[PDB]
Design a binder for this molecule. Structure first.
Ligand SMILES: O=C(O)[C@]1(O)C[C@H](CP(=O)(O)O)[C@@H](O)[C@H](O)C1
Ligand SMILES: O=C(O)[C@]1(O)C[C@H](CP(=O)(O)O)[C@@H](O)[C@H](O)C1
Ligand SMILES: [Cl-]
Ligand SMILES: [Zn+2]
Ligand SMILES: [Zn+2]
Lengths: 385, 382
């Protein structure tokens, strides 16, 4: 049972089995309310909901009158982070009998999609209600579920409408990783590596050295036996550094830019290759190009760059828009430089039309304590595959 | 030039003419940015935008590269506080070339509708951008534009989705009142009276006295300017106070909702023919009658509440001939009213909360109070 603090509070609980025997109980005592709304997708729900309903009803029995638990199953996939889905969950909540009010405690059970969506619904529901995060994916456990950033996508782009709404509790249950598909697991490692690359060379070395052991466990269909503590240590280091940065610059006045390393170009790449290609994968290619950019600017050494590539490759992450696997999945989708530039214009870190990108000067230490303005011409160079 | 502080910042500026010769200049210096988005409705825009464009372009000529001013005209009326209009403005802001980014400074020019809408758009645009309020209606100047509450409506109700996003600046230009329709002016008085009724008997008395002078001018505020302004400011000052003490409404901010528990219920039915302040007027009477039925408020204060509302030309009953005509085909049954109050945002679970006054100028508690649904049924018919 490990606890991390963020923005002055110990909202993060990390352990194995939290879902089966801790969440329900904790919600009733620390998140007192008459109404609990659980949001997930048809896949995750069918596998983890039954267990929870009984754990909830068993903890609610003591309370009199017993609070209610309402479950909403959204379609799986990126398609659900939409205005439509936000509105559907909202109407559903309001039309309940009785309607869900401001005491409502929302529960986000799923990955970044469910998390981003659910968190956003909570921030604006009657101008804001409490919510908790229950990340079921590695990426969610090491990144998305922490920090309060929420959002949905629009036809014009990804994460353009949203809000920073901090969850009251963050339940990181490593047991969810037991059933997480190999690809998804690899996807999340992209964020783990990113987090280390901007904080400490020691942690990054740990990821390089742990690669094989981690991967073998992920590739063995049996699950993290003699590597548990190693897995928890890598996850926690990631979660701890984010909590640190978010605590110092919650609404991104500067420092929080760093968490976006590899995302300036990554998001551009993603807006094109999605949904066939995943977020972490895009961010992987993104870290390589942004690392190559820091090189083209005499900020980052050529050695660190190659090392960045070696680590991403070691965990099975693409490091080029030319990756054989990426092409087969996208049916050939081409990422034209002009398209990648147009998409980057919508990057949220931009100061006016000045494109800002996180630049590393060395593994473990950023160039500045924020993104850096970069001429559009210097960006064009690393965008050509 | 009066300045009021709220939440530790001197964001509120109050004066006559701010629009014509202060906003533009102030935005450029204190709200530095490359992009300015102005939102209004087709009516207000056509009358006040031309003036501003030139004042802006005249203040921008210095800065280089030149900062831009983008104008978006939304349809007038409550119909615009919708998910659709929120989406449209956002897509329009994201579609600009270059796209409006996180440095964007949004300008809400209009009443509560534009204000609530625009403020809400700013709060979630790329997770939040700055915005300023330029209230053109009395109600907006004395209430809506202050405090950060924003929202849009849904088919199921009013102000159900929204956010508390504080504006960087609040420009109260009394000159806008020069062209404000009599009805609209009366509408806003409903909030002025409410604010006094929950803060000071002294202020409420002054409102009782200025009743005729104010009305004669409304039915252009020459030898009464300082009277009007003093009334406006007292209202704005008390709200800033309450919002400072309880921003996200964890208690004391409930009081600003006096008359709104039943008021909003009434409104959800009679809207859009009947206005917000008017509904809140009837609402204040019933909630005052409720405090009486509970032995909290004296029968004298209630009647006095009625006299003041009537004096300013505000309805004090669902029967009121004026409301009747205006809404020929609409009734307010105890049932529909009750179903509507279920959606009140102050309700602690199924417990319906309502602000109770024990006397003009002093609330029963420092928050709304739970009230049995049966005690609410009584005053919901009159
Ligand atoms: O500040 C954050 O928490 C992030 O930068 C937030 C981004 C999403 P954003 O670029 O839409 O802010 C996420 O992809 C990244 O992994 C971490
Ligand atoms: O807190 C506020 O500013 C208000 O209570 C907010 C309400 C709107 P709400 O009931 O939708 O919050 C407004 O009508 C009232 O006059 C003042
Ligand atoms: Cl929204
Ligand atoms: Zn990411
Ligand atoms: Zn009101």
């Amino acid at each position: 049972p490990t606890k991390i603090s963020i923005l002055g509070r110990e909202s993060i609980i990390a352990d194995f089995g939290l879902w089966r025997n801790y969440v329900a109980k904790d919600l009733i005592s620390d998140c007192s309310s008459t109404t609990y709304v659980l949001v997930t997708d048809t896949n995750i729900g069918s596998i983890y909901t039954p267990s929870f309903e009984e754990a909830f009803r068993k903890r609610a029995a003591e309370i009199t009158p017993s609070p209610r638990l309402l479950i909403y199953n959204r379609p799986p996939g990126e398609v659900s982070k939409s205005r439509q889905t936000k509105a559907d969950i909202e109407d559903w909540m309001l039309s309940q009998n009785p309607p869900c009010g401001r005491d409502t405690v929302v529960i986000a059970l799923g990955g970044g999609v469910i998390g981003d969506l659910t968190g956003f619904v909570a921030s604006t529901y009657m101008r804001g209600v409490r919510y908790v995060q229950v990340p079921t994916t590695l990426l969610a456990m090491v990144d998305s579920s922490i920090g309060g950033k929420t959002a949905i996508d629009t036809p014009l782009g990804k994460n353009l409408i949203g809000a920073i709404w901090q969850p009251t509790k963050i339940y990181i249950d490593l047991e969810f990783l037991e059933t997480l598909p190999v690809r998804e697991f690899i996807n999340g490692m992209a964020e783990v590596i990113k987090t280390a690359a901007i904080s400490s060379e020691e942690e990054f070395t740990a990821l390089e050295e742990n690669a094989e052991t981690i991967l073998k466990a992920v590739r063995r269909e049996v699950r993290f036996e003699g590597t548990e503590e190693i897995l928890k240590a890598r996850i926690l280091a990631s979660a701890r550094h984010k909590a640190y940065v978010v605590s110092a610059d919650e609404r991104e006045g500067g420092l929080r830019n760093l968490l976006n390393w590899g995302h300036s170009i990554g998001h551009a790449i993603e807006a094109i290759l999605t949904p066939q290609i995943l977020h972490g994968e895009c961010v992987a290619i993104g870290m390589v190009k942004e690392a190559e950019l820091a090189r083209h600017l005499g900020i980052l050494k050529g050695v660190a760059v190659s090392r960045i590539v070696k680590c991403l490759a070691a965990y099975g992450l693409p490091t080029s828009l030319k990756d054989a696997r990426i092409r087969k999945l996208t049916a050939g989708k081409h990422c034209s430089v002009d398209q990648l530039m147009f998409n980057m214009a919508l990057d949220k870190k931009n100061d006016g039309p000045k494109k800002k990108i996180v630049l590393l000067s060395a593994i473990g230490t950023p160039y500045e304590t924020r993104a850096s303005v970069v001429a559009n011409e210097d960006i064009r160079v690393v965008l050509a595959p």
